[PDB]
Design a protein around this ligand. Structure first.
Ligand SMILES: [Hg+2]
Ligand SMILES: [Zn+2]
Length: 256
């Protein structure tokens, strides 16, 4: 199957997943001078105070932190969205070096990593249903740059040792996502897709202007994860990002 290697990387995904060369693929390059300032755009509403983290798992391509989405516990609303979207999981994409790792680019600038908080539209009842609609998902993307340590990320970092290989999971309760948000909620938004197979075109992307800073030690720890399963040859989990895709007519609107 698919990966980020020489023989199964992004350039090969189209073979199993034809939609890889569809009309609304992600990520893209955000050209700040071409983005349209839209004054009709409402402020984002992030309601994560009653979030319920359950666990963390190494799925062989990233590590997912999962949340209880059986009720409106952690939700996203406002901004470009109509209705309420529930948080289901967050994950990151990171590089082998500090100069790469992000999926979206800003004026061709690459960040060290990118945080994706994934939410599904409650009018669809379940995640599986929401991935059948063009307005099924909303992904909140936050860039990471190397500098000062992010206190709020430390809890995730310390548990990576326990889920080093593909298929390993750990109980991960009482984790507050609010510690991973930047000061400002200014954003760019555009209609896209999931950045991993099945590359479904169901996402409303909200990418935050303001990056969060994390320390070299913190991102270092991400780089120690393995794509492989226990008892298998070691393949470091690095560079698990997809290159920018053709914008193809779409328009990127700015909230600022
Ligand atoms: Hg869809
Ligand atoms: Zn992602």
């Amino acid at each position: 199957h698919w990966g980020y290697g020489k023989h199964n990387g992004p350039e090969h995904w189209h073979k199993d997943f034809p939609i890889a060369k569809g009309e609304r693929q992600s990520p893209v390059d955000i050209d700040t001078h071409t983005a349209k300032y839209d004054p009709s755009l409402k402020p984002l509403s992030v309601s994560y105070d009653q979030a319920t983290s359950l666990r963390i798992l190494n799925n062989g391509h990233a590590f997912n932190v999962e949340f209880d989405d059986s009720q409106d516990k952690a939700v996203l609303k406002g901004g470009p969205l109509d209705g309420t979207y529930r948080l289901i999981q967050f994950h990151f994409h990171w590089g082998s070096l500090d100069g790469q790792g992000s999926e979206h680019t800003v004026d061709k600038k690459k960040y060290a990593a990118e945080l994706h908080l994934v939410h599904w539209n409650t009018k669809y009842g379940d995640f599986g249903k929401a991935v059948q609609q063009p307005d099924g998902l909303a992904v909140l993307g936050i860039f990471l740059k190397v500098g000062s340590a992010k206190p709020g990320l430390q809890k995730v970092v310390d548990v990576l040792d326990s889920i080093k290989t593909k298929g390993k999971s750990a109980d991960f309760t009482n984790f507050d996502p609010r510690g991973l948000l930047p000061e400002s909620l200014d954003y760019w938004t555009y209609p896209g897709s999931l950045t991993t197979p099945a590359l479904l075109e169901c996402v409303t992307w909200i990418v935050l202007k303001e990056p969060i800073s994390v320390s070299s030690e913190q991102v270092l720890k991400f780089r120690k994860l393995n794509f492989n399963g226990e008892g298998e040859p070691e393949e470091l989990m690095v560079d698990n990002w997809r290159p920018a895709q053709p914008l193809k007519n779409r328009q990127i609107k700015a909230s600022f």
